[model samples]
Target: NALQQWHHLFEAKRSPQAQQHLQQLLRTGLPTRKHENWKYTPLEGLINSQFVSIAGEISPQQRDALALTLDSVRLVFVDGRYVPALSDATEGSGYEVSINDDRQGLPDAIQAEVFLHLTESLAQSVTHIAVKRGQRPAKPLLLMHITQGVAGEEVNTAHYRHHLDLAEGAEATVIEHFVSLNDARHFTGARFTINVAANAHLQHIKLAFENPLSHHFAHNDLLLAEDATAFSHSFLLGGAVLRHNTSTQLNGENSTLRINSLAMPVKNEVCDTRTWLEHNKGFCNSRQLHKTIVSDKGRAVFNGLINVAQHAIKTDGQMTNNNLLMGKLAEVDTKPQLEIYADDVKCSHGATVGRIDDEQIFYLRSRGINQQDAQQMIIYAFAAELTEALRDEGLKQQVLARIGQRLPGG
Candidate 1:
């Protein structure tokens, strides 16, 4: 039924490639519990809901309230359409930006991914950002997405696609901020394609604090060249149903990759994260840390896999997931896996799900802090590791403030 709805919505405006992908999606259908990768997340809620394409306006006050206090080239998008008036006129001398409406061919590895197909079919345009060779910007690049829904109508839907390329020896920091202009029901789909050239470096930060009634899905495809390095930090703090998938390819020798994520789901929300790290060349390294804090009747799911090819000798890969359950009905499902075909490689994976320690809380309480404040302090300390990793103090405080608001006792 949802497929039929989507077909009716976009059939008239579909491109050649979009039509082909739509046909393919129709044949295979959405993934269900039978699919191992989607076993814990069900599409029933999304499938049964009806959605429409409706754009809403944002006030100047609303825009100012959502803007972060940071020096960066800010690009603003509302309901998947770029708004140049709200964006910086100049993207700075470090990078070039372009907009493309003609959809490109999908990668072989992700051709069958239904969400990617959906994004390609529905996205208004693709934003391409290319960092010049050996150039680093004085400020980070910020991409701000603001979603809004109309009242008395079906839930709105928005899709966006971004392509980021870092040339040889270049270094850059990119911050992706997603928020809602109002408390309206909506669905958002986003896909990012990233390429890191030889000896390049990339620092990426993604903050998702959309409306609680929104459903969000995002996929990131990353490729690394010789000696290239990439570090990403993700904070998933909102949305009723949220799913994030990241696939990294260590395709060159001595390449490195690191991912750190913190997810907090509360009040019957669902947050799911999946990652694939492939060590395709020798002497590569990869590390991942995913943490979730669930309260009320919320649920969290994490599935991470590190794969080492036979030719990827001397590869080092490590993965860890830790979960904190704050309510009796809170739930967490985590699976960290390793598949190594190389002989001389070091790979390890582990997961933990538990609650706060009573002794630690008691110790804090004895130090003159109240019970609720003490619990909040412990949670903050638990999340400080990833927050402290942020290079910008303003951004760090913004994230902390959001965390404080989302915590149970607050």
Candidate 2:
């Protein structure tokens, strides 16, 4: 395959086990339309193009200009390379943060997953953060990845691997914010693995505001133990082409997982998300809600699956997805699926795709609002429904402002 010719470039950094996985992927090649998972999202550009993996220098002024002022523990990165000088990693109790590139091996569940392998092969380093047992930090932790690509016309590429480990009886909140300069066209990939031990609580949030000319791809893997709870939320606003995949497993008793997602794409952009949730133990609960607002020639796709194993008795799962089209040129595709193997389990799934109701727009217009304002108001309300899942007022308002700015004539 084409990738085999370049395998030697990254072979030395990988462990023996990872090298073997790379070889296996080389033989099979990247996923194509023939693969069920890639039926809607293709990898033609990433597979057919070449990009330099080395890190380039950027000016200090440019770096400070793109920084966010949210109060939290910050670990900063530029172009997928860790920048310790800019990071504020103050020592604290109940949590530990570490960064390294040396790992023993890749997990079995992600061996065949092409995106994870792609990240491992190209990443300059990996970041690992753990929350200690029975310790809860006062402030949230933030992993901020900013990309101000080199000042050039050539395209560059970077990948990142991040893991969050929560010990028993641990409680913490983590947010990953990905942003890039308004210029430059680069290819970026990231993968996250989160594990929650028994009686642990974790809140995970993600915000993507990438460059409008760049391509982005990411994957998230989550596992929960007995009595564990997880609340995950994601919001996407910019990216020329973006694709995300998440796989969650509820493998212990009395555990709960809630997933919420929102995507607002404008112009000629594309956003896609695919998720799978498995109930591997009894008395487990899982819920999911995904929404999208598409305008102009934009497009969005959502695919969600919930599976209850035969041994998972008394499992409760529900999923819903809805999309709003602002114009006839916009497009949306959604699929909510449930596969049940246990007789005593409760599972439900549904999906909807439609344009804004004329009656609501008319009602708004009658309330002393102009036609354009009424149209934008209705769309803003549609996207705001997903923001209710966020508990943090600061983060909630930040996301709302971003979404509001994306509305027509905002």
Candidate 3:
């Protein structure tokens, strides 16, 4: 039914390539419980829901309130449409930005990803950002998306695509942010493709803070060349149903990659994150650390896999996931896996799911601390490792403040 609905909406406007992708999507169909990847997160609600395209203008006050206070070149998109009036001009920003309607140079391995196909087929335009070779911008680049909808209106949806490229020996930092202006029901599908050339470096940070009535799904594909390095950090703190999928390939020798995420789903929200890391060349290194905090009947799922190819000798990979349950009904499902085909590679994986230790709380209470304060201390301690990893002090403080507001008695 959903497939037919999408076809009715976009088939007439699709390009030849998009029509081919749509055909592939029709063949594969949407994932259900039978599918291993979709087994943990239910898709029935999304599949059965009806969504229409809705548009509205945003005021300057609303824009300033939702945007982060940072010194950066910021780009704003409302309902998946870019707004040049609210975005900084890229004329002399050390990076080039362009908008197109068709996909470019997609990898064969991800051709069957249903969400990616859906995004490309429905997106109004694709945003392309390229950093010049050996030029590192002085300020971070921020891409912000704000979803606006009327409360008590029909459900709405939006799709967006972004491609980021770092040329050889260049460096850049990009921040992706999402927010909602009201408590209206909406759905968002976003896809990002990133490429790092030889000897280049990239820092990617994503923050999702949509309304609780929103459903959000995002997919990111990353490719690294020889001696390239990349660091990705995600902060997922909003939405009714949120899912993030990432696929990373270390295709060149001596490349490095690190991925860390902090997800907190409160009330009845659902947050799911999945990652696939592939080491295709020798002497590559990868590390992943994912943490989730579930409260008030919320659910969190994490599935991560690291694969080392036969020729990827001297590769080093490690993955760890930790979950903290704050409510009696909170749920967590974690799976960390490693498949190493190379004899000379070192790979390890671990996962832990548990609530706060009563003994630790008791010790703090004995020192004259209140129950709520003691519990807050333990939660803060558990999250300090990832929060401290942020290089910017101002950003780190902002993140911590948000985390504090989510805790009890803040």
lDDT of 1 by residue, 1-410 (tens): 88887777676355677677677768767888989788788687788888787656676678879888898988888888888778885545567988766656334343247887787677777788889899888778888999887786477888887878899999999988889888987888888778899999999998988988888888888889999999999998878999988888888999888998999989988999888888989898888889898997999999898889997999988898989999899999887778889889888888888999889888888988878988888889888888898998988999999899878666
- Which stretches of model 1 miss by more than 4 angstroms? 12-14, 105-112
C-alpha lDDT values of all predictions:
0.84, 0.78, 0.84
Q: TM-score for model 2?
A: 0.93
TM-score of 1: 0.96
Task: Report how far residue 162 has shifted in candidate 1, in Å.
Answer: 0.5
Error of 1 at 335 (Å): 1.6
Summarize candidate 2's per-residue lDDT along 5-65 as a digit string, tens digits.
3474466346555566466657667776877666666466556655555565656576667
Candidate 3: residue 264 lDDT (0-100): 86
Among all windows of 10 consecutive residues in model 3, the one with the lowest summed lDDT is: 103-112
Which scores higher on TM-score, 2 or 3?
Answer: 3
